[PDB]
Design a protein around this motif. Structure first.
Motif, PDB file in Angstrom:
ATOM      1  N   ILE D   1     -64.835 -70.195  18.390  1.00  0.00           N
ATOM      2  CA  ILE D   1     -66.030 -69.890  17.610  1.00  0.00           C
ATOM      3  C   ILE D   1     -66.749 -68.671  18.184  1.00  0.00           C
ATOM      4  N   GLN D   2     -66.034 -67.904  19.011  1.00  0.00           N
ATOM      5  CA  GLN D   2     -66.590 -66.649  19.506  1.00  0.00           C
ATOM      6  C   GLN D   2     -66.799 -65.659  18.367  1.00  0.00           C
ATOM      7  N   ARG D   3     -66.040 -65.804  17.276  1.00  0.00           N
ATOM      8  CA  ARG D   3     -66.298 -65.006  16.078  1.00  0.00           C
ATOM      9  C   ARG D   3     -67.663 -65.333  15.481  1.00  0.00           C
ATOM     10  N   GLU D   6     -70.248 -63.917  17.620  1.00  0.00           N
ATOM     11  CA  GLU D   6     -70.374 -62.486  17.357  1.00  0.00           C
ATOM     12  C   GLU D   6     -71.205 -62.222  16.105  1.00  0.00           C
ATOM     13  N   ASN D   7     -71.028 -63.042  15.065  1.00  0.00           N
ATOM     14  CA  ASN D   7     -71.845 -62.883  13.861  1.00  0.00           C
ATOM     15  C   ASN D   7     -73.316 -63.183  14.140  1.00  0.00           C
ATOM     16  N   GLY D 101    -108.641 -91.591  30.394  1.00  0.00           N
ATOM     17  CA  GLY D 101    -109.384 -90.374  30.130  1.00  0.00           C
ATOM     18  C   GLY D 101    -108.859 -89.576  28.952  1.00  0.00           C
ATOM     19  N   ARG D 102    -107.556 -89.296  28.963  1.00  0.00           N
ATOM     20  CA  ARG D 102    -106.947 -88.560  27.859  1.00  0.00           C
ATOM     21  C   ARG D 102    -105.883 -89.389  27.155  1.00  0.00           C
TER      22      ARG D 102
END
Lengths: 134, 251, 84, 130, 654
Positions: D1-3, D6-7, D101-102
């Motif tokens: 999925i390096q393509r 890249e997109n 307190g909070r």
């Protein structure tokens, strides 16, 4: 050219996928080379005419601007066909059927002569010899 | 999680499959709409003027004869239309809003075909960018000059509400409306998160309601009557009972 | 529940008035922290709604701008009294 | 999925802010094994866009796990108050308000959101605790 | 520039400037840098002005089968004369395209205006087509020219035939709305008939009187049909001019059958008798279904003069005296009580297909009349006459192949057309006592799609061959991959096939026929399985036949359809040999056909095998009598013969 296309051939390129990528880039080329001429026809034509304007825009691509120009005529029976194109074949087969059915009724001659050509472009009949031998 | 498995090259079909296996509340609302459509009130084909009388050889045959003596046509050219076909189309579009708001989609298509209504078939032929198509539908519904039930049909199939036929929405019908609105808005935000859709597709960002209403607000709006009142179908108990049973605030 | 558009405009105006009053009172009344937090939440919600005000007339624009200015000033004051 | 990376990198170089780009790319690094750069990229997509639910979850979980309860409070507070899609954030906001307190406000809020919660009434019991 | 050349040329054509367009286009053509289309308008203008023969010759040397420029060259040669050159060029055209009834009209007109040559080349196409008011009027004109030029037997033979041709042509084809266009031709026919009967009282040796009988029956049926025409054209099919219609149809049905049985083909007379009698029977059925009507006709609608007057004024609006030149001499009393049968009707219908080959209009008319009498046509005899050698089946029904057009698939398509056209018309404001409006008078029955496929099928059978039409509608018929037809069609096909196939006694045709039935119902099952408040099939386009509120088989009748399908499959097995699991499978259906098949099974199996089996037959017949007590004739053969002999051989067993 078979050049790098953003890692098109990443993992085991399928023939179909490769062919589709090639088609995409080739279509991009067609749009890029006709851009200048189309831009002139937009400028030359004054009031948009569905007979001619639609024809020019369609063959030059850019469906978005085509739809913008079609603000005047309330038709989008085309955004459905060219932005999704899910049932493309069947859809246009049915539109062809509808068109020939109207032709088989001896009417639709009142309609602008070349608006019919715009419809044929979408339907899929490059030459239509009408009942009047046109 | 196989239906909710996706990738970059996975189509909108698979992104929708992921949403469908993923969202419990949204899928429940989708089943809710399915029930709205399962309980269907329909005008008959061969016994109602819906199309039994509007079964002409073709649409606007009366208009064509007058001229001798698509929805693009009158939208472009204003005055021409003829009243006989106008009324036939009123009854047909009434039939169509009926059948489709009932959810008998292929039957409504069978109608649009056996009559052969170019604009009907065309406007409703797509199997499923797509965002551009939907925005376009919304804009066409916004446009004037189209019939009442057809206008509502288009607004609905687009993800917006007209009123013409939606003047006739029951508590369960307007419930289908508001639930489908929540589901479509979460669907659009879902694709936007699943960025798979293109930028130029959301061509008119605001004119579509991307943000969703939550189940409690859907119920509050569907219960609030146009007279700033509590709804009668709301005060009814058996409907209220099934309503709490679905809404899961039942104990 | 029954009033339409009730949430939008109604909530907007109510919030405006309440925020003014509470700001004033709390500043004077030893700045109670819980109330300060509530005020902060409310002012964030009010900002979120001022941008969505729909304009049909000219008075709508003027009122909108006024409200925005006032709420921004109040928001600044609240930040000053909380974080620093 | 390096393509695909890249997109996303292209749409992140051109649209510098790259909100959806950072979300999807850090999400690719989350699905794959790049958790540190996934954290940095998710904070980048955060400073890009305030709507990201899964970025909210990944970043808040990274901080909460690495022990920066303050950074968890930051992520949770921002993502909750933007409230376009986020529900569980106030819970860890209350937990960190206890970590400092909070917490009473958010404990009453949780008791208003989910009633049959011994754990929430017990976080309130701790805030109340002699 | 072809655009400027043809722009100028057609603009001058549309402004009329023939010589200027010839000039421009011919100068461009003689330059020929890219152009051909100059030649046509060039020839047109050269004709407008010894010269135009040149461009006519160009068009002919590029396309000698061209009608327009062909007639143009004939006329230019007749200018450089008149009748002689016209006849000669028309004879050349008739040597190039002889079957052309119109070119034969040209030759006959130009010879008449070789009188025998005109007579020949007119009388040929006149009876070759018979649809020709043009050729028939030119023929009567040739006959008038022969009469006044001379100023017998063959003319007394052919006058009736030819004037029937003209009358029927202008009647049915012109859509002549019951006005003088039909009345006048019928009136001349009346003159011809009174003339021939009063003058030449032909003997039993000549065929003059026999063809006179032929045409008296003819003119009579056409008189009745004209009456129905008056009704339809005026307002709607009437109540007063229908017993006149059945009266004319009586006066033609019950003209006696002519057959001489020794050139001069009396087959003409036998075959015209066949068609006339078939039409007469069908209409004497359909116009008066009810009886107590036809003797009423004989007794009241006709008498010595009143009935003839009533039927005379209608057709003839005060143009013929009663005593001089009318139907007064003609006697009508000798007709008696006899209806046409479904047997002689079947014979005269196989006689009707003699001149109605492969005609979808005729086939719908016939199948619809047989279904209006509610008994399906003897269609396989018609198919085995029209389409001679088409085998009854195909090798595979799982591969859509167009080069395997089937005869059973044709009975399939035609039952489809019968059912559907019946339905379309029944909705088409029939809800006009005539239902089918006899063949010359009604308008369309099949639709555009059906006509297209029927003609493409005829081209496939009886011969750049496009046959995607054949592929598409075989797809639809064979219950194939993605079909648009709905249950109803396949279902009723399987019903017709069930009846008529199990009715058959042929072994290897029963087997294939119930194989088709299995095909249909097993393929019908899966669709009707998807009847769960969800649509049947996807229909982007009305495939060939889409109805509604009729096609939609509702949720209930699943049980009967499924169990009848089980009987279908076990039947295909039982006539193929596994008669034991046939028993088992028929012990899954619980209807009367179940008990009856199991009874036939026990009987056939153990006539002379075992006894304790016959107790089963006893109990089976007792079940069947208990069921008949409620009036169950759901079996194919009633029980008055079924239970008596069975319980008797049961009493012979006891």
């Amino acid at each position: 050219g078979q050049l790098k296309e953003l890692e098109a051939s990443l993992d085991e390129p399928n023939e179909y996928v490769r062919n589709l990528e090639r088609r995409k880039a080739f279509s991009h080329w067609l749009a890029h080379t006709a851009e200048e001429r189309i831009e002139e026809e937009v400028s030359l034509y004054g009031p948009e005419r569905h007979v001619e304007a639609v024809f020019s825009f369609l063959t030059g691509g850019r469906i978005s601007d085509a739809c913008r120009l079609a603000q005047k005529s309330g038709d989008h029976r085309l955004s459905l066909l060219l932005s999704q194109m899910v049932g493309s074949q069947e859809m246009r087969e049915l539109i062809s059927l509808q068109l020939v059915d109207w032709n088989k009724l001896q009417v639709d001659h009142y309609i602008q002569e070349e608006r019919l050509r715009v419809f044929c472009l979408l339907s899929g009949t490059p030459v239509w010899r009408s009942s009047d031998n046109r | 999680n196989m239906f909710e498995i996706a990738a970059p090259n996975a189509s909108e079909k698979t992104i929708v499959d992921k949403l469908f296996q993923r969202d419990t509340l949204v899928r429940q609302s989708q089943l809710v709409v399915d029930w709205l459509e399962s309980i269907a009130k329909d005008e008959v084909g061969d016994f109602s003027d819906n199309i039994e009388y509007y079964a002409k050889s073709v649409y606007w045959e009366n208009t064509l004869h007058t001229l001798k003596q698509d929805p693009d046509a009158p939208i472009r050219q204003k005055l021409p239309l003829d009243d006989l076909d106008r009324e036939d189309d009123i009854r047909l579009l009434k039939y169509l809003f009926t059948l489709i708001r009932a959810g008998m989609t292929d039957e409504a298509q069978r109608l649009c075909k056996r009559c052969g209504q170019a604009w009907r078939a065309a406007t409703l032929e797509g199997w499923k960018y797509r965002c551009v198509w939907k925005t376009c539908c919304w804009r066409m519904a916004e446009d004037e000059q189209f019939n009442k039930y057809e206008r509502a049909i288009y607004a609905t199939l687009s993800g917006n509400l007209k009123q013409l036929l939606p003047v006739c929405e029951s508590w369960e019908d307007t419930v289908w409306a508001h639930f489908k609105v929540m589901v479509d808005s979460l669907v659009e935000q879902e694709i936007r998160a699943s960025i798979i859709s293109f930028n130029e597709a959301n061509e008119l960002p605001r004119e579509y309601l991307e943000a969703n209403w939550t189940l409690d607000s859907v119920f509050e709006e569907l219960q609030a009557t146009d007279k700033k009142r509590v709804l009668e179908e709301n005060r009814e108990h058996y409907h209220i009972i099934q309503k709490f049973v679905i809404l899961a605030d039942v104990d | 529940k029954h009033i339409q558009d009730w949430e939008t405009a109604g909530k907007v105006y109510l919030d405006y008035i309440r925020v003014i009053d509470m700001l004033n009172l709390i500043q004077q009344d030893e700045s109670s922290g819980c109330e300060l937090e509530k005020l902060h939440t409310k002012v964030m919600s009010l900002c979120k709604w001022v941008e969505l005000i729909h304009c049909y007339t000219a008075k709508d624009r003027l009122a909108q701008s006024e409200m925005a200015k006032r709420v921004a000033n109040i928001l600044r004051v609240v930040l000053s009294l909380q974080q620093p | 999925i390096q393509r695909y990376v890249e997109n996303a990198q292209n749409s992140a170089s051109s649209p510098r802010e790259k909100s959806m780009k950072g979300f999807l790319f850090a999400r690719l690094y989350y699905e794959a094994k790049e958790y540190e750069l996934a954290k940095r990229s998710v904070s980048s997509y955060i400073s890009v866009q305030e709507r990201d639910p899964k970025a909210h979850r990944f970043l808040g979980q990274l901080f909460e796990i690495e022990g920066n309860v303050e950074k968890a409070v930051g992520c949770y507070k921002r993502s909750l108050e933007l409230n376009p899609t986020q529900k569980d954030l106030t819970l860890r906001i209350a937990e960190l308000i206890c970590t400092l307190g909070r917490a009473e406000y958010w404990v009453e809020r949780a008791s208003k959101l989910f009633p049959g919660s011994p754990e929430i009434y017990r976080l309130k019991e701790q805030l109340l605790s002699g | 520039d072809p655009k400027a050349h043809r722009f100028l040329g057609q603009l001058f054509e549309i402004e009329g400037n023939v010589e200027k367009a010839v000039g421009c286009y011919k100068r461009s053509l003689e330059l020929n840098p890219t152009q051909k289309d100059l030649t046509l308008r060039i020839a047109e203008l050269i004709c407008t002005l010894g010269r135009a023969e040149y461009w006519v010759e160009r068009a002919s040397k590029l396309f000698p089968g061209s009608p327009e420029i062909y007639r143009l060259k004939e006329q230019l040669l007749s200018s450089q004369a008149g009748w002689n050159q016209l006849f000669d060029l028309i004879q050349a055209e008739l040597f190039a395209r002889p079957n052309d009834v119109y070119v034969n009209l040209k030759l006959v007109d130009l010879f008449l205006s070789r009188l025998e040559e005109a007579v020949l080349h007119c009388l040929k196409p006149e009876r070759r087509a018979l649809r020709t008011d043009i050729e028939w009027c030119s023929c009567v004109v040739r006959v008038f020219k022969e009469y006044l030029a001379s100023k017998n037997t063959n003319m007394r033979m052919i006058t009736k035939e030819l004037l029937l041709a003209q009358c029927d042509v202008v009647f049915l084809t012109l859509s002549k709305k019951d006005v003088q266009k039909s009345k006048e031709a019928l009136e001349r026919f009346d003159q011809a008939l009174l003339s021939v009967k009063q003058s030449v009282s032909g003997t039993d040796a000549s065929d003059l009187s026999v063809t006179f009988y032929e045409m008296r029956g003819h003119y009579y049926m056409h008189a009745g049909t004209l009456l129905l025409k008056m009704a339809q054209s005026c307002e709607v099919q009437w109540k007063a001019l229908i017993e006149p219609a059945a009266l004319c149809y009586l006066l033609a049905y019950q003209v006696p059958k002519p057959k001489s049985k020794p050139d001069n083909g009396q087959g003409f007379l036998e075959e015209l008798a066949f068609d006339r009698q078939s039409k007469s029977g069908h209409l004497l059925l359909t116009l008066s279904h009810g009886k107590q009507n036809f003797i009423s006709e004989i007794i009241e609608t006709f008498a010595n003069q009143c009935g003839q007057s009533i039927l005379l004024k209608f057709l003839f609006e005060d143009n013929l005296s009663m005593q001089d030149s009318f139907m007064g001499s003609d006697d009508i009393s000798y007709v008696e009580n006899r209806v046409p049968d479904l047997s002689e009707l079947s014979q005269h219908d196989n006689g009707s297909l003699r001149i109605h080959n492969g005609d979808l209009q005729h086939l719908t008319w016939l199948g619809l009349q047989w279904h209006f009498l509610s008994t399906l046509p003897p269609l396989r005899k018609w198919l085995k006459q029209i389409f001679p050698r088409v085998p009854q089946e195909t090798s595979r029904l799982e591969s859509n192949i167009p080069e395997s057009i089937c005869l059973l698939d044709l009975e399939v398509f035609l039952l489809a057309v019968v059912q559907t056209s019946y339905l379309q018309l029944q909705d088409n404001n029939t809800t006009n006592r005539p239902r089918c409006l006899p063949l010359p008078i009604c308008k369309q029955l099949f639709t555009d799609r059906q006509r297209s496929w029927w003609d493409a099928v005829y081209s496939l059978i009886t011969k750049a061959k496009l046959r995607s039409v054949i592929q598409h509608d075989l797809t639809t018929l064979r219950a194939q991959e993605k079909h648009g037809l709905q249950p109803a069609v396949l279902v009723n096909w399987a019903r017709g096939l069930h009846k008529t196939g199990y009715s058959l006694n042929s072994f290897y045709d029963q087997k294939e026929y119930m194989g088709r039935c299995v095909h249909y119902w097993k393929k019908l099952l899966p669709l009707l399985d998807l009847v769960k408040q969800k649509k049947s099939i996807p229909e982007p386009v009305d495939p060939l036949f889409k109805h509604f509120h009729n096609k939609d088989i509702k949720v209930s009748e699943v049980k009967d359809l499924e169990d009848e399908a089980c009987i279908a499959f076990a039947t295909l097995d039982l006539v193929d040999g596994k008669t034991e699991d046939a028993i088992i499978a028929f012990e899954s259906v619980k209807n009367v056909v179940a008990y009856w098949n199991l009874a036939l099974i026990y009987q056939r199996k153990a006539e002379e095998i075992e006894n304790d089996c016959l107790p089963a037959e006893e109990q089976e017949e007792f079940q069947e009598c208990l069921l008949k007590c409620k009036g169950f004739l759901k079996m194919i053969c009633d029980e008055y013969s079924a239970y008596p002999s069975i319980a008797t051989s049961l009493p012979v067993p006891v």
